[PDB]
Design a protein around this ligand. Structure first.
Ligand SMILES: [Cl-]
Ligand SMILES: [Cl-]
Ligand SMILES: [Cu+2]
Ligand SMILES: [Cu+2]
Length: 508
């Protein structure tokens, strides 16, 4: 009924790592949580919407003293929240005003690959504009935008390129959920950073091939935030946007909250928690009820023993409303019995990370699957011992979770998901269908692992057609371009991920 324990295997948690960086409460003064504005469309009708999404360098006051140099989408850090709607024709102008190339990846959006998907093979160069057009046919959910060059995605997310994407549909608009964005429905983008001299970031100084975590939590680009509650119920859209950290979320007083949404859909039924764990790139939407609190009270959201976000309780209109027993009808696609069970094995830690025995190669296709055909994917984490949880992510689909070592999925995994935490020794079985042809990455979403090789890619295809040609990114193109952009020789260019490739004697 009420889940008081984190689901993942406790001995594998990040906090047992030899080089774990605990979070430390910053000295900085507490302040209102930043809620990113809603990106104003250029233009909108019932059928169409037009946006311009602009990657940009700038500065952001994060700590007392100097501004921290940051990157962002239509703002200096993170990004304004982008809203998309099932069935609506969407036109996005991607505009790079940074000094380096970037990529615009719509994490969890079921769009064509490899260009609209905006992964490794979709560079936008400084000064360039690219136009994309798509229509999403997927249920309401919380997705996100982040940068995806291969490598280094980790550098560009650390700089600050991430933004929440909200997907609306008609069914979700019929439900009795908080939805007044910025008042009772808010992003809780969870991140960490380490601040250095003059409050700057230095990804390189902090590089660790097993995952970069700093001591200072940063929620929606804010240090020591607090939220003014003016409603009995608040909807929190949790996003783990850290490069590696696991968030182990729970309130003072064990105040319960009820998860209503996962990565790719509403959950079929609400699930009540007191303690909720999220690995990288996972989303969880929860409803918190503040009815048992007096005006003037204060409630604190923690991760482990560390306070993250304070809820200040003001006067609120009482709210009767209960959630229905059924939020969402999961229609599971159908597996053709003549397909194999695909088996995908994540191996290694630190610099040794790999999938199915190999590190990612941007030019090499690792797998194929025909479109419109669901297949069972067995996904294994080989790590022994106590080891670690790797969050596995697949571009271009939302899957369903069928089993964890032959037993039931976790209670909040009965809806659609694009990212899944896999414990050491574990095999999760997934039901994976790709509606669109293209090239799509699959990988660990600990971002240093991804950059450091724990990545592969699948070509999805129409079996009624000849093989397609895709211009794939090559490493020489990337390093000439970054060399020109930084004003250096290709041989002095540094990128997060290189060290993992170099040390195992492997060619990026
Ligand atoms: Cl300040
Ligand atoms: Cl460099
Ligand atoms: Cu993705
Ligand atoms: Cu990993």
């Amino acid at each position: 009924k009420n889940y008081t324990d984190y689901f993942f295997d406790e001995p594998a948690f990040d906090l047992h790592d030899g080089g774990y960086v605990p979070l430390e409460v910053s000295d900085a003064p507490e302040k209102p949580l930043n809620v990113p504005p809603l990106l104003k469309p250029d233009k909108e009708t019932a059928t169409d919407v037009y946006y311009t999404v602009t990657a940009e360098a700038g500065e952001t006051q994060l700590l007392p003293g100097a501004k921290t140099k940051t990157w962002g989408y239509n703002t200096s850090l993170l990004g304004q929240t982008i809203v998309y709607r099932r069935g609506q024709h969407t036109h996005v102008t991607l505009k790079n005003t940074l000094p380096e190339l970037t990529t615009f990846h719509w994490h969890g959006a079921n769009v064509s690959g490899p260009y609209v998907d905006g992964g490794c093979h979709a560079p936008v160069y400084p000064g360039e504009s690219k136009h994309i057009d798509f229509t999403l046919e997927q249920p309401a959910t919380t997705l996100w935008l982040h940068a995806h060059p291969c490598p280094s995605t980790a550098e560009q997310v650390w700089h600050g390129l991430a933004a929440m994407v909200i997907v609306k549909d008609d069914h979700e608009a019929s439900l009795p959920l908080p939805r007044n964005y910025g008042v009772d429905d808010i992003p809780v983008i969870l991140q960490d950073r380490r601040f250095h001299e003059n409050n700057q970031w230095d990804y390189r100084a902090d590089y660790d091939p097993d995952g970069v975590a700093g001591p200072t939590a940063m929620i929606n680009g804010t240090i020591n935030p607090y939220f003014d509650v003016t409603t009995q119920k608040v909807r929190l859209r949790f996003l783990n946007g850290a490069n590696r950290r696991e968030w182990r979320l729970h309130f003072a007083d064990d105040l319960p909250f009820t998860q209503i949404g996962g990565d790719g859909s509403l959950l079929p039924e609400p699930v009540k928690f007191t303690h909720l764990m999220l690995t990288c790139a996972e989303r969880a939407e929860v409803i918190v009820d503040f009815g048992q609190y007096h005006e003037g009270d204060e409630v604190t959201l923690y991760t482990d023993d560390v306070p993250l976000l304070k809820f200040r309780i003001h006067a609120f209109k009482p709210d009767q409303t209960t959630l229905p027993d059924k939020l969402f009808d999961v229609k599971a696609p159908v597996v053709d019995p003549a397909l194999p069970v695909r088996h995908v094995v994540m191996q290694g830690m630190d610099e040794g990370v790999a999938i199915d025995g190999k590190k990612f190669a941007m030019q090499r296709i690792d797998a194929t699957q025909p479109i419109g055909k669901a297949q069972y994917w067995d996904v294994t984490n080989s790590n022994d011992a106590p080891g670690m949880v790797h969050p596995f992510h697949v571009h271009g689909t939302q899957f369903l979770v069928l089993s964890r070592n032959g037993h039931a999925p976790y209670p909040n995994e009965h809806g659609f998901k694009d990212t899944i935490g896999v414990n050491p020794g574990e095999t999760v079985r997934l039901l994976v269908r790709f509606d669109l042809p293209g090239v799509y990455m699959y990988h660990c979403h600990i971002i240093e692992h991804e950059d450091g090789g724990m990545m592969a890619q699948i070509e999805t295809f129409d079996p009624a057609k000849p093989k397609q040609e895709y211009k794939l990114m090559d490493m020489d193109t990337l390093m000439m371009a970054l060399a020109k952009e930084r004003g250096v020789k290709p041989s002095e260019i540094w990128m997060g991920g290189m060290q993992s490739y170099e040390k195992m004697g492997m060619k990026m």
